[model samples]
Target: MISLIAALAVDRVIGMENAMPWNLPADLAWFKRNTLNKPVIMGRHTWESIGRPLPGRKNIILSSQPGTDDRVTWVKSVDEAIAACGDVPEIMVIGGGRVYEQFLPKAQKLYLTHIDAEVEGDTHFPDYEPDDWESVFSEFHDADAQNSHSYCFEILERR
Candidate 1:
């Protein structure tokens, strides 16, 4: 099954100036640990944001433009990305707004880090529809004295 994973703000903001607005090392560690050896599908913009392919995983990047990065398997569409996954048991749709929307309807599972605060952003995540998903798990985390914003991790499955 295809899964979508991202961390977003309360206003559904996904990014600002091609970077994450908040820092959450825990979430990053969780992503690195869980996505190891998995096939990760992402847009060109997301790949640009990350700057390099993640280690221990197969990176499939969807882009309309063809470039010299042979390290990443470049696909022209989301379907191509899925096909690139081959026999993998699960495919993770990593983001940059438009790419997430492209696969949202078909995604069986969603792993989201929901930040409590909001910020102005140029990109936005697809809107959440209660009719389409069931929240399977959620854990709230308050900001410690050192952290600026509180957040929660939510796992949802297609209803």
Candidate 2:
């Protein structure tokens, strides 16, 4: 299975200046829970935005740039990343716009944290038809002292 995971504002804004605009720890925790111990594919910019490979998971970076480290597997494209995953049952695509767009069509599922606010951002989630996907699960959370904004954790599967 190929899953795309992201937390985006109601306006579909996912990032500002290469960083997340909101500090929602709960959402962050949800991300870690789902992606841990799996292979994660991301674009070069997304990899840079994160600063380093996420621990406990295989970090596969899509980049034309030539480089390699024991911490990450660098691939030139999405197909290459998928090929690298081999026998892994699932691969998570975590991204920065272009990467998400590239894999959205191929994704079998989506784990989305829908933050209920309009945010100003330089990057946005790609548009997709809601009818093509059906929500399989969803849980709502209100903004609290620990969380910056109200949001819903939703799991969607392609219909």
Candidate 3:
């Protein structure tokens, strides 16, 4: 199974200036908790935005560049990345916009954090048909010392 994990503002903005616009430690932790030890597939730009491969997970970069490093397994396409994951039951597609767009239709589940605020951004999550998915779980959080904006963690599965 393939799942997509992302945090987006109310306007569906996911990135600005090559990075996430907000600083939410709780959301970060939530991401870590869900993706730890899974095969994480991302676009080259997403990998660059993160600066380094995340620890305790298989970092698979979807890129045409012909190179591999200790921290990353590089593949030319999403199918290649998914095949590289072998028997792993669930692969997490963590993204920049293009990567999310490519995998959205094939994703079995979506783990999304919906932020309350909208800000200027250059990257946005792709639009989807609401009727195609069913919300399986959701939890709301209010702004606090550690989190800058009120948000909800929502898990949706394709119907």
Q: TM-score of each candidate?
A: 0.94, 0.96, 0.97
Relative to the unseen true structure, what is the C-alpha lDDT of residue 116 in candidate 3, on a scale of 0 to 100? 92
Ten residues in sequence with the least summed lDDT for candidate 1: 144-153
* lDDT tens per residue, model 2, 18-114: 9886789999899999999999999888888899889999999998988566679989877899999888888999997999998998999999999
lDDT of each: 0.87, 0.91, 0.92
Q: Model 3: runs farther than 4 Å from truth?
A: none
Model 3, 117-158: lDDT tens digits are 877999999998899999999999999988889999999999
Order the candidates by lDDT, highest first: 3, 2, 1
Best by lDDT: 3
Better of 1 and 2 by lDDT: 2
lDDT of 3: 0.92
Question: How many Å off is the CA of 25 in candidate 1?
Answer: 0.5
- lDDT for 93 (candidate 3): 94
Off by over 4 Å in 1: none
